[PDB]
Design a binder for these strands. Structure first.
Lengths: 58, 185, 51, 222, 171, 159
RNA sequence: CCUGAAAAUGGAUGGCGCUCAAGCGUGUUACCUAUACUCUACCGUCAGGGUUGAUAUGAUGCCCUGACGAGUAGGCAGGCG
RNA sequence: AUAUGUAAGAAGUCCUUGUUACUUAAUUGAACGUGGACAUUUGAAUGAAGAGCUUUUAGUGGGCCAUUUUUGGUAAGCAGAACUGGCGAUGCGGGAUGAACCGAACGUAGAGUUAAGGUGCCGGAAUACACGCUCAUCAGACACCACAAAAGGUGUUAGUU
RNA sequence: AUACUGCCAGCUGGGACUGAGGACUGCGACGUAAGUCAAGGAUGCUGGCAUAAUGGUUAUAUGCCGCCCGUCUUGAAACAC
């Protein structure tokens, strides 16, 4: 009692019903996976930038 | 025949004529439909759809949240409009002299408003005293801070509060949740 | 309530266009042209009739 | 406020002025068409007299009519037909000729009949079957007031201005064509002239680029 | 339908390196202008390194016969494809026009060899009027002197289904 | 049994080249990639560390991370009915900048130049690109170019 | 076109029948008709809207406009008993 | 060749480097940012029937058949893959008859026009018009398709030397 | 002049189906102005019966069409249940 093993029939149609729309993009992407040295530096630089901006517009 | 691109006879996907059988809610909906139709005020339109909104989509807004909205710069004298229930917060010890328009007020919240000196008014009084929503500020409660939403979207590597009944040791804290027991999620 | 098609119902045609009126008045659908005898090239006729 | 005498007089004066300016514009358009045609003819004659050949400028506008049904059509031609608004059989649309649109037409060759329409057939199509796309609704044009209200930002204030833009494709041809709802033509009154439609017009069929015969085909279908 | 004689002249697209290309001309029998341009491009592709995208057609003019009301013999050199191979042949036909001549040529090709317009190329069509030059008996038999013949067994077409006397085939 | 390895069916794809074997020229190491740069992936068969997968061979992505000898590239890969964002740690030998992005940046600079020129005098710059328009009318001469008539050639064996 | 070319109940270019065909190859061109296309009426669905002038229409009321309509497994809605 | 990855800008382009514990020999770079300049061609075409997003759940998890690519097999209405379109789930007109072929998809009616297929009669529509070819003491007659070959015949017709 | 092709907001004729719809309205046309129109959907005139005449129901007859339902199934009218 053998049966059909595999097929890609109807798969593209099923995908394209409500499918291949592009993923949504963001400003300020996640900083995970980037160099942790750069992460520490960016954290300190952002803190300093916020402090300086508050000082500039008190 | 027509080679259709969109789905035929597709409903709006939004809410109108709210499921509540409250005759008074129907009266408010009628008044604000008239206001939105004959006024062109975006405040009127948004208040109409907020009236259409359901319960979990109308979270309670606390007097502390209203106080924060008033502490916003240039918003001390704005009529705070919430479409829902205003609850009393015991974590604040001061209230300003604002006017609050809302569907429902808890006893403690209404007492807080009138003791601070402001007035609790309904949406019909808000309409009669501000047909275009002049000098109004709409408040909304946190919709995504409930048990259901914390359970929603559960899966591997999401961290979304697994649907459980008993919480503690030996209740889903094992193989599949720590490296010492098989894998970690 | 009912669509009235131009190219018939001259009333609707004139409602959409008064140049229909002046076009009919001046008979611009059958308009003559001034004749000028610009003769072609012998090389042109020879190329056309070439075997 | 009677709104019987003064309002009516002001509205009628505005309408009369608009009609006068529409008439002036239509006269200018007719003069331009006649001048262009006669200039083409004299250019050909001048080339012949000077011994040179006058090559006709490639036509800037085509009319394309989907003539195949909605069944058993591959995805890329189906999507191109949808993009050209050919979602039904015997359904027509005006197309500006560019490389992109020519590639689209080459893609959908076996399902459409397209060609180069003239002012006569363009006017026939617009007058007989003219429907605007207003609030996503197919309302008949039927009024220079409607056309002006929906295209007055581009200066198109009448069916004559719309037709002029279509025939002499201009800056706002895209907007005018998109305002024009796709034409729903009937089957040809005298038949298709061929025993079998789904061969190329060159091969004795009906689909493909019938360059100047689209005028006769669309006048029979309209 | 009935063929029409066209002269189609076109060139390659003029580039900066070589302006004013060679302006090749062809005489072709086609149903109308669209098929005329199609056949011109097909033959110019068969002969020269150029396609429709890389070239343009500078002129296409219909050619009417100089005298369409006098009988002249026509020698047609054609090449055609059969189910097996390609063959060149030469036919002679008596006709009043070149367009009608290629009409009968295509009809006779389809009748006698099942060759279609797809498979038939007309290499050359030459008008002639000299006797002892035509090589086909089925033309010389009509070019014989003082040619007169009857039409035996005349059949008269009837409009009604019933006729009330036996027909006569006299003439 | 079927075989689906990491480098399965990558024979010719990761085949190095013809007469381009051996060491790699140092321009590739000298190129500089910053975060946000669009880069093309073409795996080098002679370098075995940092090699991309055969799926990402020939794809284009955005640099999101920079490291000692590598670069983090983001590629949208179609998985089922959606694209997922895959992050690769590729090496500078396998990675290469995008001439398309360079051309677009050059066009942006040019476009700004023409807009500045328009602000100077306003000569209807028409910033946008237009497709291949149909060719207008032209007059072609026959002097020195009399048309040479062509005819179909008879069939011949030519063997 | 013919010879190659032989299977079992009686038998199938669908049948009758057809021979300058009602056969074959190719061309005009007229004509027939699908629940398809065009227009019109009506039904329903969907969408977009208008309406607080009488002391008459639960504004779930009235009205305008346009598009759409196949359906097993299945889902939901509105109704009958 | 067909398929296939990107880009075609405002989350953008140019002067102030303001912050940094990163980096540089170095106020050198890197990242982020404050101040300023850029409108109806905000940087190709076409379309968009409203973008986007979340929850929850049914049935399904035996498939089969065209046209192309293609594997095993002599082959199979055989077995197995790729893309697409269909049948399943679908009537309707045509192929006489048929799940898949050709047209075309379907609310209830009317008129007109056609598609595919046809017009001798069955059967609605030319025993049309035009050119040829064929005479079979097993003619031939319209795809999928319901079969025929090598070889041969001054039967007849048309074609270099 | 004339096979031809294209255009006419050119001129006449013969047929057919349809007649949807509202308490002031709109867009227009027509002699130097009264107002009328084919201009946001049919009216005018005239006949026959003041009834099974038209129709509804029903039974035959006639033309064409129509396989026995439910189920399993890729496939059922099935010589499958």
């Amino acid at each position: 009692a053998k049966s059909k093993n595999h097929t890609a029939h109807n798969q593209t149609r099923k995908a394209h019903r409500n499918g291949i729309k592009k993923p949504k993009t963001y400003k300020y992407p996640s900083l995970k996976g980037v160099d942790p040295k750069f992460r520490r530096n960016h954290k300190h630089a952002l803190h300093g930038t916020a402090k300086a901006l508050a000082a500039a517009k008190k | 025949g027509i080679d259709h691109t969109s789905k035929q006879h597709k409903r709006s996907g939004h809410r109108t004529a709210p499921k509540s059988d409250n005759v008074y809610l129907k009266l408010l909906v009628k008044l604000y439909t008239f206001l939105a139709r004959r006024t062109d005020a975006p405040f009127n339109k948004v208040v109409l759809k907020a009236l259409f909104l359901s319960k979990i989509n109308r979270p309670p807004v606390s007097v502390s949240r209203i106080a924060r909205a008033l502490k916003q710069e240039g918003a001390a004298n704005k009529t705070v409009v919430v479409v829902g229930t205003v609850t009393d917060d015991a974590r604040i010890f001061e209230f300003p002299k604002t006017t609050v328009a809302a569907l429902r007020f808890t006893a403690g919240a209404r007492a807080k408003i009138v003791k601070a000196g402001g007035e609790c008014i309904t949406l019909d009084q808000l309409a009669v005293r501000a047909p275009k929503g002049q000098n109004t500020l709409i408040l909304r409660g946190p919709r995504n801070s409930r048990e259901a939403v914390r359970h929603f979207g559960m899966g591997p590597h999401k961290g979304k509060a697994p649907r459980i009944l008993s919480t503690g040791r030996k209740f889903e804290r094992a193989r599949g949740r720590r490296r010492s027991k098989g894998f970690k999620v | 309530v009912l669509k009235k098609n131009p190219l018939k119902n001259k009333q609707v045609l004139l409602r959409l266009n008064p140049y229909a009126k002046v076009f009919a008045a001046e008979k611009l659908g059958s308009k003559k042209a001034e004749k000028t005898g610009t003769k072609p090239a012998a090389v042109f006729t020879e190329t056309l009739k070439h075997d | 406020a009677e709104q019987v005498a003064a309002e009516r007089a002001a509205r009628k004066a505005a309408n009369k002025e608009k009609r006068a300016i529409i008439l002036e514009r239509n006269a200018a358009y007719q003069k331009e068409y006649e001048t262009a045609e006669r200039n083409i003819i004299q250019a050909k004659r001048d080339a012949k007299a000077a011994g040179s050949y006058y090559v006709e400028a490639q036509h800037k506008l085509v009319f394309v009519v989907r003539i195949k049904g909605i069944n058993k059509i591959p995805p890329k031609p189906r999507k191109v037909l949808q993009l050209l608004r050919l979602t039904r059989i015997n359904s027509g649309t005006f197309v500006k000729v560019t490389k992109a649109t020519l590639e689209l037409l080459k893609l959908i060759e076996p399902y459409v009949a397209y060609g180069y329409p003239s002012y006569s057939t363009i006017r026939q199509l617009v007058y007989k079957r003219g429907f605007g796309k207003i609030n996503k609704q197919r309302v008949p044009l039927s009024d220079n007031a409607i056309i002006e209200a929906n295209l007055g930002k581009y200066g198109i204030l009448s069916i004559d201005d719309l037709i002029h833009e279509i025939i002499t494709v201009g800056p706002h041809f895209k907007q005018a064509n998109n305002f024009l709802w796709p034409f729903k033509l009937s089957n040809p009154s005298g038949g298709w002239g061929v025993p079998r439609k789904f061969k190329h017009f060159i091969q004795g069929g009906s689909f493909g680029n019938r360059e100047e015969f689209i005028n006769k085909l669309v006048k029979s279908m309209n | 339908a009935h063929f029409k004689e066209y002269q189609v002249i076109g060139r390659r697209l003029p580039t900066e390196s070589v302006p004013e290309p060679k302006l090749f001309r062809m005489r072709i029998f086609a149903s109308n202008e669209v098929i005329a341009k199609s056949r011109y491009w097909y033959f110019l592709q068969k002969l020269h390194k150029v396609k429709k995208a890389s070239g343009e057609i500078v002129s296409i003019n219909q050619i009417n016969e100089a005298h369409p009301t006098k009988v002249k013999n026509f020698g047609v050199w054609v090449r055609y494809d059969s189910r097996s191979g390609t063959h060149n042949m030469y036919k002679e036909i008596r006709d009043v026009s070149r367009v009608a001549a290629v009409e009968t040529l295509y009809q006779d090709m389809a009748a006698r060899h099942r060759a279609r317009f797809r498979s038939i190329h007309i290499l050359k069509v030459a008008e002639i009027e000299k006797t002892a030059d035509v090589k086909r008996q089925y033309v010389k038999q009509f070019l014989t002197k003082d040619l007169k013949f009857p039409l035996p067994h005349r059949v008269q077409k009837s409009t009604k289904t019933f006729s009330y006397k036996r027909p006569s085939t006299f003439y | 049994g079927k075989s689906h390895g990491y480098r399965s069916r990558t024979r010719y794809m990761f085949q190095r080249d013809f007469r381009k074997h051996g060491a790699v020229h140092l321009s590739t190491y000298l190129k500089v990639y910053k975060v946000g740069d669009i880069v093309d992936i073409k795996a080098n068969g002679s370098i075995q560390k940092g090699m991309p997968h055969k799926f990402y061979q020939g794809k284009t992505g955005v640099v999101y991370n920079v490291t000692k000898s590598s670069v983090g590239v983001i590629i949208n890969k179609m998985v089922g009915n959606r694209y997922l964002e895959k992050r690769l740690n590729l090496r500078v030998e396998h990675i290469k900048h995008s001439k398309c992005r360079q051309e677009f940046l050059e066009r942006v600079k040019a476009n700004a130049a023409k807009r500045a020129e328009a602000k100077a005098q306003g000569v209807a710059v028409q910033l946008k690109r237009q497709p291949a328009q149909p060719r207008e009318s032209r007059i072609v001469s026959t002097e020195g170019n009399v048309p040479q008539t062509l005819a179909p050639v008879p069939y011949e064996t030519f063997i």
